[PDB]
Design a protein around this ligand. Sequence first.
Ligand SMILES: Cc1cc2nc3c(=O)[nH]c(=O)nc-3n(C[C@H](O)[C@H](O)[C@H](O)COP(=O)(O)OP(=O)(O)OC[C@H]3O[C@@H](n4cnc5c(N)ncnc54)[C@H](O)[C@@H]3O)c2cc1C
Ligand SMILES: *[C@@H]1O[C@H](CO)[C@@H](O)[C@H](O)[C@H]1NC(C)=O
Length: 467
Amino acid sequence: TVGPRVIVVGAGMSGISAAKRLSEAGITDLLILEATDHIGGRMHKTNFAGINVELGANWVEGVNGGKMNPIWPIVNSTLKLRNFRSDFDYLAQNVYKEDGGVYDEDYVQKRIELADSVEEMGEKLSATLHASGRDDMSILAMQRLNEHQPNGPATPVDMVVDYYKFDYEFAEPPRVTSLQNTVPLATFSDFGDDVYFVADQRGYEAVVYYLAGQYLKTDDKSGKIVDPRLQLNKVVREIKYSPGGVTVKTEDNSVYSADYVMVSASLGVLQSDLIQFKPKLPTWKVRAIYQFDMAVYTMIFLKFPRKFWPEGKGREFFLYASSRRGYYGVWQEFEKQYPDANVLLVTVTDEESRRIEQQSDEQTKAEIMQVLRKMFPGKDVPDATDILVPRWWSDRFYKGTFSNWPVGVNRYEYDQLRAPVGRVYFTGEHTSEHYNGYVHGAYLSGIDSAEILINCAQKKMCKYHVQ
Ligand SMILES: Cc1cc2nc3c(=O)[nH]c(=O)nc-3n(C[C@H](O)[C@H](O)[C@H](O)COP(=O)(O)OP(=O)(O)OC[C@H]3O[C@@H](n4cnc5c(N)ncnc54)[C@H](O)[C@@H]3O)c2cc1C
Ligand SMILES: *[C@@H]1O[C@H](CO)[C@@H](O)[C@H](O)[C@H]1NC(C)=O
């Protein structure tokens, strides 16, 4: 109403957080333009076969550690969102042979232990690397170094173990991933090694909503955010920035003025042509944008006439050691989370995600049936009655699921990513210093971006030195 005006592009986690931090400081003249018809962004639930499941973020990652993960209190104490600790101690008993049945546990255990040791030496190595990133390498290069081979895990069991250890976490193979920025990982180093599966019918998005209703006006009766400051179905298509101020044009031809703009759209959106910047963003910034990775993590859901898979102690997570690396490999059954549901969850990432998103649900269901018959022969496995294939990559407002730190990108040029250009500020998981790719990362990045601008608006200090 009175003071500087900031336009926040996008009402995701970091978007909502940023505006909240801005409000708190006094900058209340905010306008949040959100492309979709809902806040939450990549924190989004949907109805699959009469239950609510997550399309996007599904875990609170990093719990029980030396520092409190800011999302965990909100999830466990404040909203008391239904969630369960994920236990992976029994994967050794649950790795399926490409053709028929499981491997000898004692065998698989060796391979897991071996894999863990190679990664532990990765940590030692990573701890010695110069902070300039000068002597950084891919996770694979390290793996090769320890295993004394021209290659990383090359055999069906080893690979699915490798996939589970890395791909299943970062949504890209070890060979594209920076050793120095994932091994070890601050998310786990700081907040603990535990991850917690949110399975609450309100949605994991309830966290975003909770935060949003601490500064945005909500209807006393229904609870729906009624604040005129949040505008849904507003698709920012052009940002005009000059010494004087900023213009923000949306897709319906509205043009807005403000003193500053906070961009919370994903790295993939920035990488696309969705938001045009006039004038064009400096080279240094563009090169930072296009060198970072916007990975794709696809959570394929399936429902079945009956339950043909093992349930009980250490049965939640099972692997499929395909000879075609990353082929329908990581499986999750929901006996605890959605009792009597008959839903399985297979995760694919990266190269496979792009294929699968592009093909018909039927074609996919077909492929998955085949695999499931091989995993459980001498059982009668019914065709899946329903399939869900989240198409995040294909979606213009996301163009991926989360960022991954790639080999080549050093700490400096990562900072160029978060750096502002004029009155154009950036936020989102991909700007998060130590927690890119994560809900908390997005959440904390909101606060940091906000504070950077607040420091400029109020304290009148606006030179940002990239480091
Ligand atoms: C499949 C998947 C699984 C994941 N797994 C985990 C996990 O379980 N645990 C965890 O901690 N994190 C995980 N994440 C990552 C986590 O979801 C993100 O780090 C976090 O949600 C990012 O929030 P954000 O505000 O940075 O981006 P977003 O949530 O994408 O916010 C951007 C918002 O801007 C909007 N938008 C984009 N373009 C425009 C525009 N042109 N105009 C106006 N609005 C625009 C979008 O609609 C969106 O609402 C997962 C993500 C996905 C999708
Ligand atoms: C979450 O809440 C439960 C049940 O109220 C409580 O016992 C526990 O302290 C919390 N769990 C974690 C991991 O913080």
